[PDB]
Nucleic acid binder design. Structure first.
Length: 150
RNA sequence: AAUGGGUAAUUAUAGCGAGCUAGAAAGC
């Protein structure tokens, strides 16, 4: 099996600078056990097994199903979820518990239960002890913000 | 009945605890 490195680059940055900052990512992708699809940065180096089945079709599809059948929580909510996923001490688990429970009582009570299943999903895979689900959620929310940008 | 006096209780209670939008754009 193979090991990829995907780098995101802006408009018209030169291909000499572009083919080298991506060789770094695919040698960081070769910098674990067998293979990895090292995405955007030098971290985010997920194994392909705990990618496509687990990020690109599991977590991002549930993130996409939440924020497209729902109206009141927007990019500000996703921004704070990414911030809490990026910092992540134990105190941020407490702050995330307070935040999600506090916004659950701030929906329309016809949108409370869809939010409640999403709250339980995000709080379950924020505190999951595997350590992988937080990183996968962070990259999945990266992808969802990169889709919905105007 | 006189005369001397006041004595006790509560000292805030129940909530909201931020929300949304932007999350970098042009150039060299």
């Amino acid at each position: 099996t193979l090991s990829a490195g995907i780098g995101l680059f802006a408009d018209k940055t030169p291909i000499s600078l572009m083919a080298h900052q991506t060789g770094e990512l695919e040698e960081a992708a070769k910098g674990n056990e067998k293979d990895s699809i090292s995405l955007f940065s030098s971290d985010y180096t997920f194994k392909f097994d705990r990618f496509i089945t687990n990020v690109y079709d599991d977590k991002l599809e549930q993130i996409r199903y939440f924020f497209n059948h729902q109206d009141e929580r927007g990019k500000n909510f996703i921004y704070k979820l990414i911030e809490l996923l990026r910092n992540h001490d134990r105190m941020n688990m407490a702050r995330l518990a307070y935040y999600l429970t506090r916004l659950e009582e701030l929906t329309r009570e016809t949108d409370r239960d869809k939010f409640k299943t999403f709250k339980n999903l995000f709080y379950s895979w924020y505190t999951n002890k595997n350590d992988k689900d937080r990183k996968e959620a962070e990259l999945a929310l990266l992808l969802y913000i990169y889709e919905i940008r105007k």
